[PDB]
Design a protein around this motif. Structure first.
Motif, PDB file in Angstrom:
ATOM      1  N   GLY B 260      -2.088   1.400  -8.655  1.00  0.00           N
ATOM      2  CA  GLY B 260      -3.374   0.889  -9.098  1.00  0.00           C
ATOM      3  C   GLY B 260      -3.482  -0.616  -9.186  1.00  0.00           C
ATOM      4  O   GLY B 260      -4.403  -1.200  -8.620  1.00  0.00           O
ATOM      5  N   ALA B 261      -2.546  -1.240  -9.890  1.00  0.00           N
ATOM      6  CA  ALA B 261      -2.493  -2.695 -10.011  1.00  0.00           C
ATOM      7  C   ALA B 261      -2.582  -3.403  -8.678  1.00  0.00           C
ATOM      8  O   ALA B 261      -3.346  -4.332  -8.526  1.00  0.00           O
ATOM      9  CB  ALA B 261      -1.234  -3.122 -10.724  1.00  0.00           C
ATOM     10  N   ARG B 263      -3.787  -2.337  -5.773  1.00  0.00           N
ATOM     11  CA  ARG B 263      -5.040  -2.075  -5.048  1.00  0.00           C
ATOM     12  C   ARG B 263      -6.163  -2.929  -5.605  1.00  0.00           C
ATOM     13  O   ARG B 263      -6.936  -3.572  -4.877  1.00  0.00           O
ATOM     14  CB  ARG B 263      -5.423  -0.619  -5.175  1.00  0.00           C
ATOM     15  CG  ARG B 263      -4.318   0.330  -4.779  1.00  0.00           C
ATOM     16  CD  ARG B 263      -4.873   1.707  -4.575  1.00  0.00           C
ATOM     17  NE  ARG B 263      -3.823   2.718  -4.640  1.00  0.00           N
ATOM     18  CZ  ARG B 263      -3.975   3.989  -4.292  1.00  0.00           C
ATOM     19  NH1 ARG B 263      -5.144   4.424  -3.876  1.00  0.00           N
ATOM     20  NH2 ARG B 263      -2.957   4.822  -4.383  1.00  0.00           N
ATOM     21  N   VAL B 264      -6.231  -2.928  -6.925  1.00  0.00           N
ATOM     22  CA  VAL B 264      -7.191  -3.734  -7.626  1.00  0.00           C
ATOM     23  C   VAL B 264      -6.911  -5.175  -7.361  1.00  0.00           C
ATOM     24  O   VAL B 264      -7.784  -5.858  -6.873  1.00  0.00           O
ATOM     25  CB  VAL B 264      -7.172  -3.470  -9.140  1.00  0.00           C
ATOM     26  CG1 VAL B 264      -8.079  -4.472  -9.873  1.00  0.00           C
ATOM     27  CG2 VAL B 264      -7.624  -2.030  -9.390  1.00  0.00           C
ATOM     28  N   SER B 267      -7.703  -6.186  -3.930  1.00  0.00           N
ATOM     29  CA  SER B 267      -9.132  -6.157  -3.635  1.00  0.00           C
ATOM     30  C   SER B 267      -9.852  -7.410  -4.136  1.00  0.00           C
ATOM     31  O   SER B 267     -10.678  -7.995  -3.427  1.00  0.00           O
ATOM     32  CB  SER B 267      -9.747  -4.901  -4.234  1.00  0.00           C
ATOM     33  OG  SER B 267      -9.155  -3.746  -3.664  1.00  0.00           O
TER      34      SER B 267
END
Ligand SMILES: Nc1ncnc2c1ncn2[C@@H]1O[C@H](COP(=O)(O)OP(=O)(O)NP(=O)(O)O)[C@@H](O)[C@H]1O
Ligand SMILES: Nc1ncnc2c1ncn2[C@@H]1O[C@H](COP(=O)(O)OP(=O)(O)NP(=O)(O)O)[C@@H](O)[C@H]1O
Lengths: 318, 318
Positions: B260-261, B263-264, B267
């Motif tokens: 998650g970290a 990807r965020v 992005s």
């Protein structure tokens, strides 16, 4: 500061064990005796206090939940009841108490400082919410986020191909950070959060507008604070024909092995909590603010939403 | 800023795809044409430049590696060679170039700004190292860290019980952050990193001192910058009798789905890079500094170690 007690309260989050482990190890290393309080504040009333050794927290850092347990003790909102909990600590020569929980469990810890000058109280933000003040992230958040990534990836893989839509309910309480971060990470076309004015017309407008234009499946991520997954499926059937996969993630989000971030973050705060008790400070929550370990009074805590990041999520979808 | 190219260079890290996805989507949304450069800077010389659409980056955010590829192009250290790469972009009306890689790949991007006023250059820190300046974490680091957690947990589970010791080699290059964060998260008794003066006597002193006191297995986490896992096993056999599980983690650490970290984080930086190209800025690396998105000149970047966190790791072990 010669004796410290520690307890876990509220919803269990990944890294609670690491946090305990940190508190225990740090304390003993500084030649402080440490006492494990079992079953949240219920334990505190039941006198479920037991002395802990270095071995008490071996093989825990990777463990989900908490090995002292957690409880709801709604009765802890009362002066008279809390009297019995302070005595139990008072009688045992415990000078510091460490509380690992959410903003509810903090309030309990704030009371004990207010009602006992003899016990120093520190709070560690063990919760999934990201709802807590003076910390950018709470212990549990990073783990939950990936749990959502994973379970979403599994709904995808275990699904029929006829399914165009995935209305997915993510847990926070009153904070849409999880759903925004999770929404972004699984590349969700809509993200429904309590902080932004939710246009269901616009969301159905979008599903109709891009699936039926050849999209396999759209996914809608929904914050429980905002509404239920079924509510979102109901409200969307008011414009458009869809009922394809209302998956209500729930309490699995609380479980599982903490990820790296939470173990490290838990450990740093577990340590820091012990340092601050030796420094003689009290009635504070510890956290990480702008990549800096900090303490914030329970005062300031009880007196976040990146709309930029939300806008980006929507740029990246269409 | 009417045409943007983007490329991936150096070691592939988890979230490179998310970062591309972000760049592409953001650019097109702002009505900019975007060109995918394949095979790092080798592609740039081969004229392996292709126009990208919104669909070019569907189903990528969760993908390990990079879908444009990566290369080593040691020849890119030369004015004369780089001339041919600038023409290939020059001839195509490309005004901005986005580079996703490590500090090596940045240098290449810095050159192109220096040798072409016509092309704006931005750098995005796609690497595992955490070695890059002006960013607290790089895109890949959080993912790698968990990959190490996981593979360590598996060595544990797939092992004989006769094994007292796990000498584990973790990847960084010249930066011991991974091994410190990983070491902390799997609760390692020793952590060997290039930044702290390594006492092998003291480490064997410790293994002998606490296993043979009834510890199942000690684990030693080793930064590749500091030394090899076998070197550490050799150097430890100079005091003490141990050769139990020299596991050389290697290139698996580079793979796998981004967490998650990453990807965020990927992005946000992928977007930001596009914003800064429209703002007319150049020769900068983007990143996250004290929980704030920032840009830092390639100047400042080429002109970190938390010894506190390392000390804590050791408090928590014995
Ligand atoms: N406002 C309050 N005043 C006094 N005690 C409280 C208060 N709120 C909660 N508590 C006590 O602390 C516990 C925490 O409950 P709750 O609010 O569910 O936890 P939380 O720490 O906010 N975790 P989460 O549920 O994940 O947000 C309650 O069961 C009570 O025992
Ligand atoms: N000092 C330099 N000057 C000019 N070009 C360079 C330089 N260093 C690297 N490059 C180019 O960029 C590529 C990057 O190589 P490398 O240094 O392995 O990547 P990195 O971006 O540092 N990633 P990692 O290997 O994970 O740290 C090289 O193959 C060259 O093509």
């Amino acid at each position: 500061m010669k004796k410290i007690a520690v307890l876990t309260s509220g919803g269990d989050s990944p890294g609670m064990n690491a946090a305990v482990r940190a508190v225990v190890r740090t304390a003993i290393y500084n030649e402080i005796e440490v006492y494990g309080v079992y079953h949240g504040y219920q334990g505190l009333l039941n006198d479920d206090i037991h002395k802990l050794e270095l071995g008490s927290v071996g093989d825990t850092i990777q463990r989900g939940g908490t090995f002292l347990y957690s409880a709801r003790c709604p009765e802890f909102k009362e002066q008279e009841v809390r009297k019995v909990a302070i005595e139990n600590l008072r009688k045992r020569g415990i000078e510091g108490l460490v509380v690992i929980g959410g903003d509810g469990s903090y309030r309990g810890a704030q009371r004990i400082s207010e009602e006992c000058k003899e016990i120093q109280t520190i709070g560690i933000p063990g919760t999934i919410d990201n709802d807590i003040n003076g910390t950018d992230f709470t212990i549990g958040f990073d783990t939950a986020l990936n749990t959502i990534i994973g379970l979403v990836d599994k709904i995808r893989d275990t699904a029929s191909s006829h399914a165009r839509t995935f209305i997915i309910e993510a847990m926070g309480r009153d904070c849409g950070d999880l759903a925004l971060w999770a929404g972004l990470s699984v590349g969700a076309e809509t993200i429904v959060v309590p902080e932004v004015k939710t246009d269901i017309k616009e969301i159905a407008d979008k599903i109709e507008q891009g699936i039926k234009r050849g999209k396999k499946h759209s996914i809608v991520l929904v914050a429980e604070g905002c509404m239920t997954a079924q509510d979102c499926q109901k409200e969307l059937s008011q414009y458009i024909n869809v009922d394809n996969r209302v998956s209500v993630l729930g309490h699995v989000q609380r479980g599982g092995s903490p990820t790296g971030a939470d173990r490290v973050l838990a450990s740093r705060l577990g340590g820091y909590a012990v340092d601050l008790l030796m420094q003689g400070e009290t009635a504070k929550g510890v956290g990480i603010k702008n990549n800096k370990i900090v303490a914030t009074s329970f005062d300031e805590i009880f007196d976040k939403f990146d709309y930029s990041l939300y806008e980006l999520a929507n740029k990246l979808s269409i």
